[PDB]
Amino acid sequence: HHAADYVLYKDATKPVEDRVADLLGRMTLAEKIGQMTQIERLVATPDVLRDNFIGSLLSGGGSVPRKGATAKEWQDMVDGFQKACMSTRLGIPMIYGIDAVHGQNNVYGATIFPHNVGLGATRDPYLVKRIGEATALEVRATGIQYAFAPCIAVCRDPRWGRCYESYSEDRRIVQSMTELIPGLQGDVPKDFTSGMPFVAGKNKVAACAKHFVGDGGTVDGINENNTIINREGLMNIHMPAYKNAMDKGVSTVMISYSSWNGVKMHANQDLVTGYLKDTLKFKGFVISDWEGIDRITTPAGSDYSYSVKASILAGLDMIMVPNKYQQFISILTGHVNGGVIPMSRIDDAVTRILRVKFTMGLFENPYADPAMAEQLGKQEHRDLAREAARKSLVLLKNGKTSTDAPLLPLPKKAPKILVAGSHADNLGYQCGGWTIEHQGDTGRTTVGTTILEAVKAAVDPSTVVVFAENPDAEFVKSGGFSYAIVAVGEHPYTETKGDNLNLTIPEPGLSTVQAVCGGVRCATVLISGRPVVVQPLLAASDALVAAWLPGSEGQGVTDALFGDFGFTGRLPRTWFKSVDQLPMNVGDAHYDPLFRLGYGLTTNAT
Numbered sequence: 001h002h003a004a005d006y007v008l009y010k011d012a013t014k015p016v017e018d019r020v021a022d023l024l025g026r027m028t029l030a031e032k033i034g035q036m037t038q039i040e041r042l043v044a045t046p047d048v049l050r051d052n053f054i055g056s057l058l059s060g061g062g063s064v065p066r067k068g069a070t071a072k073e074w075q076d077m078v079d080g081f082q083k084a085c086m087s088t089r090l091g092i093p094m095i096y097g098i099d100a101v102h103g104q105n106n107v108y109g110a111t112i113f114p115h116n117v118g119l120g121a122t123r124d125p126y127l128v129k130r131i132g133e134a135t136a137l138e139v140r141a142t143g144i145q146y147a148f149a150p151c152i153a154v155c156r157d158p159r160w161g162r163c164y165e166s167y168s169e170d171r172r173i174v175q176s177m178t179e180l181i182p183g184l185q186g187d188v189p190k191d192f193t194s195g196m197p198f199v200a201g202k203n204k205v206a207a208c209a210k211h212f213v214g215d216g217g218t219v220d221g222i223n224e225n226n227t228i229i230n231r232e233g234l235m236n237i238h239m240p241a242y243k244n245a246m247d248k249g250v251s252t253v254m255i256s257y258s259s260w261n262g263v264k265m266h267a268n269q270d271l272v273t274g275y276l277k278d279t280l281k282f283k284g285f286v287i288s289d290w291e292g293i294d295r296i297t298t299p300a301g302s303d304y305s306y307s308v309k310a311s312i313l314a315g316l317d318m319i320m321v322p323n324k325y326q327q328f329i330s331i332l333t334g335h336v337n338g339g340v341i342p343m344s345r346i347d348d349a350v351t352r353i354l355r356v357k358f359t360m361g362l363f364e365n366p367y368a369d370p371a372m373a374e375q376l377g378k379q380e381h382r383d384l385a386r387e388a389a390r391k392s393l394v395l396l397k398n399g400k401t402s403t404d405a406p407l408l409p410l411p412k413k414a415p416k417i418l419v420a421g422s423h424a425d426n427l428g429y430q431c432g433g434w435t436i437e438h439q440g441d442t443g444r445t446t447v448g449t450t451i452l453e454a455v456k457a458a459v460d461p462s463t464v465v466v467f468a469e470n471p472d473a474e475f476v477k478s479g480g481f482s483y484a485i486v487a488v489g490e491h492p493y494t495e496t497k498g499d500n501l502n503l504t505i506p507e508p509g510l511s512t513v514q515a516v517c518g519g520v521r522c523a524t525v526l527i528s529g530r531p532v533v534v535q536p537l538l539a540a541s542d543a544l545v546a547a548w549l550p551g552s553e554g555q556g557v558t559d560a561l562f563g564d565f566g567f568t569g570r571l572p573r574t575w576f577k578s579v580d581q582l583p584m585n586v587g588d589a590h591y592d593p594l595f596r597l598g599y600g601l602t603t604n605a606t
Ligand SMILES: CO[C@@H]1O[C@H](CS[C@@H]2O[C@H](CO)[C@@H](O)[C@H](O)[C@H]2O)[C@@H](O)[C@H](O)[C@H]1O
Pocket: 059, 060, 061, 099, 148, 210, 289, 290, 438
């Protein structure tokens, strides 16, 4: 268009499909396969990115330039990688992805929002939208353009170690919370075609609905195992939120490690190509999970040639290798060179990858915006997270008998109060998994406000606040306490080790609640990623609050304990009486819950 060295794909005024086709028709097989390859930052260097025409990088959980890195360190890392990609012959910018699943959670100082189960308790899709918006800003603060979220798993058994990543056992709640998508990506246009990818621009990020499909239905909630259920239950429980995601223009879809009636999702042509692509008309890109194609075989990794063939023929577009890029590229090249994988399949994968990159404006803004750095941890975002944490809490008990004075809301003025328990002053525990590290961690791992700090920030200046993590019964009886706040619950976990058959919280937890509550009236704040065995905690407590994993802003808990707002959260999951009942979901066979889905007591603001 009017310039002698004009190249259509580099013209920002041209339609996405014309730019995609113009670039595709120029590309070598190596350039195409390179687009289909995502690698860890851990194995990336400028030479590797350029020489192998790499399409994408990620940080997996915990993969950071260093502990404590600033927003600008992250931007410089990403820009460094981008500079190498932009130096290739075609200058195709890479997309950098990360798990920003409750805020930009690998990053020191990022606001940490409640995990999804808690957000399910809010029944507030617009709140979740706003969390998508703020999350996109904090992701862009670190120069990253792609978030592996939302997890739209419908967790059907809380024994799953990722159940906290599911908004609900009820697909309708999960469906409603796909509002995260236009938060992260921006609202789609008036006349948008369902299935088309969308990202508004450099202040938004590409999203990822994950993990397709039936990841929350696995047998015994075993991570990555088999989901046994007929087409009718897959389609009526596990699938419908994918269609909501298509309707809101989700840019990518990550495949599950799990199998459906014994067929690995990473090899399932019928569901990946026949259904997602050809029926839902998904036109963005399909990405593997981490070594997901390796896991097609048993043992994993034992026929990588097969893994590459099966996956790429099933319809996956981009492979999260994430380490052995040379072997992946080599193998896929050999398959294409020997006619095992046709060029039409490569061309489809590359079309989709490029369609997402061009749509989102990556060719126009490949580099980080330094003015966005200050969005990290922004106080407006913390206020939003604090609102979310507050709305997530479900009050399960407020008085031992129907005749007692309600314990909550507590008075902010009292001569002396006790805050106690393993979880009262532990930021990492109140954040849970996928915070700083993959598995979360213990202690002051980022910037936030623990429940103890929140108490001290809320009470009258005459109120003496005593902290003891695990006091004995005598300490409490002698203390002259008006009341106690005791917080206990689960330790941080994920998939690999959150898979638990007993669901009873670690000691000391119960023993501390018993010592505290046997001495003074007590409000027990239970921190968990899921329902856990709760009868003994309930029997000891005057009041008991399921706080889930509320994130960095512990003042959302005290906002409700001290009556600045009323409790409004409702269970988004069934609370079982015994683990022997499981699986047990609302609508079931012999449904006998301790608390049904939807239960929650309320209070009025004081
Ligand atoms: C050592 O195992 C660790 O696994 C985690 C989770 S596996 C997989 O990771 C994807 C990319 O981070 C997620 O989007 C997806 O939800 C998960 O199933 C991984 O992050 C670590 O890199 C890996 O070390």
